[PDB]
Structures are given as structure tokens and as C-alpha cells.
Design a protein around this ligand. Structure first.
Ligand SMILES: CCCSc1nnc(C)c(O)n1
Ligand SMILES: CCCSc1nnc(C)c(O)n1
Length: 305
């Protein structure tokens, strides 16, 4: 297809403060959301039906992530901890203590025996899921860490920071393998590996998304047209149908680009505040979007391609 046709299917209301992150479970059945209201909520991925609320953090939550078997969640909070949750029982299995300030981002590795986290304290930490202990503390950046993500086989971690850098780390050794810098270094607000593992996608607070060949250290694609000068907005690869780049925006729209041509192919209208988070369903052409304090809702969109 040349262009997708995402249309609003469901609006999910429940959070009483800004939503911070939405993520689809790997098995495609659920959507998890985190919020400044200190809560995690679980929703049906296909019907938007509210399932349950998971509570325990003492301050707002910035991020949530699923284990590969869709049974566990990890959350990152302003209370300087991460928590590991058994979704079915709602129980907090482990509280990960070590960061000295706000935890902003988190992710399981594919094996899901490890968690990576990034914090306002400018460090990246690697945790053992089963013991809950910190295995490594990486002196990753000189400003708050905005995102952390494992590659397809968990051998690498990419981190981004307001210091303008993206860095690639060897999971096993903790060594910094790459530092990525273009002709300028505006604050990097988000980063993640592509599904095929060949690229990273980085958002900078100069209204720009960039596709990098991280190995060769070269910028391949640039995506613009949206607004992003303040917030750490999640961006995504959509690969279930047409090959798109998906991101939120500070003009309250969801932006969708053709990955190859860099052309904007759709702008999704509906939210009434900054779209801070987007997520792409693992098998269906479905997008979840979430907005900040003046909106508080999550929206589910579906396309035929
Ligand atoms: C009873 C059907 C619930 S709705 C639904 N829609 N799409 C998919 C892929 C799915 O598994 N269920
Ligand atoms: C698992 C492969 C899904 S297909 C795919 N298509 N395009 C890109 C950029 C990508 O990373 N994966």
C-alpha cells in the first residue's frame, strides 16, 4: 500500500493524570498503560475493554514494558525504583533499587532474564529479573537518560540522552561500543532498534526523527513535519502492513511516515493534548496512542493496510 488508512476505533478513559506510555503485549492480547497517577492499567488490545489496575509505586510512572511471554511487566517510576509485576495476580514480584533519581525508561531483553533501565541520574543499569539485583551500572551519559532498548538477540543495548548522544553497549561486558553523533547534537529524547536489528530510530528535540545505520555510524533517513521540542515522545516501526514510522507530536496528532520516502502519509486527529506515546500491534495494523494531562485518554486506531 502507498498510504495506510488508520481510523479511530476505541477511546480508553480511566487514568486521572497524564498517560506516559502504552505498550502492546507480545502475544497481541493486551495493552498496558502507565501514568503520572502512579498506576498501571491493562486493556484489551482489540476491543479496548478495561481489564485491571496495577498499583504500588509511590510516585508517577514514566514507562512500562512487557516480558516476552506476556506474563510480566516492568515499570519505571519517579520514586527511583523499578517494579516487576506478575500481570495475572497483580503482585509486585521485585522492587529494583539502585538509581539515585527518577527512572525514566525500561525494557526486558528478548530472553527476559534481564531488565535495562535509564534514569535522571544519567546512568543505565542492567538488572537480573529473578534475583532483582543490579548486575551493571553503566556511566552512560552526562545528562538524563531518555530511552533504553535491547536489540533482537539481547546482545546490544542502545541508550539515548539529553546530552545529545546515542550509545551502543555490549550487554555482557558493559562496554560502550559506539557513540553516534551527526553534524550537531540536539537532545535525544528517544531511541530504539528496528525490528530487523539493522537500524536505530532516534528522536531529537529539534522536531526531527532520524534512522541510523548504527554499525557504520551513518544517518540514512530523516523524518520531519511533526512538533517535538520538549517531551520524550515514543516512536515506532510499523511493519505488519506497509512499512511506516509512527510517532506522537506536540501538536496533538499522531504522525505516520513512509519509511523509505520519508513522506508523511497520515496524521491522526482526535487527541486534545500532546501525544506522548504510540505503540504498534505485533501482528495487526493497530496503533495505540496516549496523551498528556489535558486529555488523559488512550486511543486505538486500525487500518486495512
Ligand atoms: C471475539 C473476538 C474479539 S475481537 C478480535 N479482533 N481481532 C483479533 C485479531 C482478535 O483475536 N480478536
Ligand atoms: C522482524 C522483521 C519485520 S519486517 C521489517 N521491515 N522494515 C524494517 C526497518 C524492519 O526493522 N523490519
Amino acid at each position: 500500500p502507498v498510504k495506510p488508512n488508520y481510523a479511530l476505533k476505541f477511546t480508553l478513559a480511566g487514568h486521572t493524570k497524564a498517560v506516559s506510555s502504552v505498550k502492546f503485549s507480545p502475544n497481541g492480547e493486551w495493552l498496558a498503560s502507565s501514568s503520572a497517577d502512579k498506576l498501571i492499567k491493562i486493556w484489551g488490545a482489540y476491543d479496548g475493554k478495561f481489564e485491571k489496575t496495577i498499583s504500588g509505586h509511590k510516585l508517577g510512572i514514566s514507562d512500562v514494558a512487557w516480558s516476552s511471554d506476556s506474563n510480566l511487566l516492568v515499570s519505571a517510576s519517579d520514586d527511583k525504583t523499578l517494579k516487576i509485576w506478575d500481570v495475572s495476580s497483580g503482585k509486585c514480584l521485585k522492587t529494583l533499587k539502585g538509581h539515585s533519581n527518577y527512572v525514566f525508561c525500561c525494557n526486558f531483553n528478548p530472553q527476559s532474564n534481564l531488565i535495562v533501565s535509564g534514569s535522571f541520574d544519567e546512568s543505565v543499569r542492567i538488572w537480573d529479573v529473578k534475583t532483582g539485583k543490579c548486575l551493571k551500572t553503566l556511566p552512560a551519559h552526562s545528562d538524563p537518560v531518555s530511552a533504553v532498548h535491547f536489540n533482537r538477540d539481547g546482545s546490544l543495548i542502545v541508550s539515548s540522552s539529553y546530552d545529545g548522544l546515542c550509545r551502543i553497549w555490549d550487554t555482557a561486558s558493559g562496554q560502550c561500543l559506539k557513540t553516534l553523533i551527526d553534524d550537531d547534537n540536539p537532545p535525544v529524547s528517544f531511541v530504539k532498534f528496528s525490528p530487523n536489528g539493522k537500524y536505530i530510530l532516534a528522536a531529537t528535540l529539534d522536531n526531527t526523527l532520524k534512522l541510523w545505520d548504527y554499525s557504520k555510524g551513518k544517518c540514512l533517513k530523516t523524518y520531519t513535519g511533526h512538533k517535538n521540542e520538549k517531551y520524550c515522545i515514543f516512536a515506532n516501526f510499523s511493519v505488519t502492513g506497509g512499512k511506516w514510522i509512527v510517532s506522537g507530536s506536540e501538536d496533538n496528532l499522531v504522525y505516520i511516515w513512509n519509511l523509505q520516502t520519508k513522506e508523511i502519509v497520515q496524521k491522526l486527529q482526535g487527541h486534545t493534548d500532546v501525544v506522548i506515546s504510540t505503540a504498534c500491534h505485533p501482528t495487526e495494523n493497530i496503533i495505540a496512542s496516549a496523551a498528556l494531562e489535558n486529555d488523559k485518554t488512550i486511543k486505538l486506531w486500525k487500518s486495512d493496510c
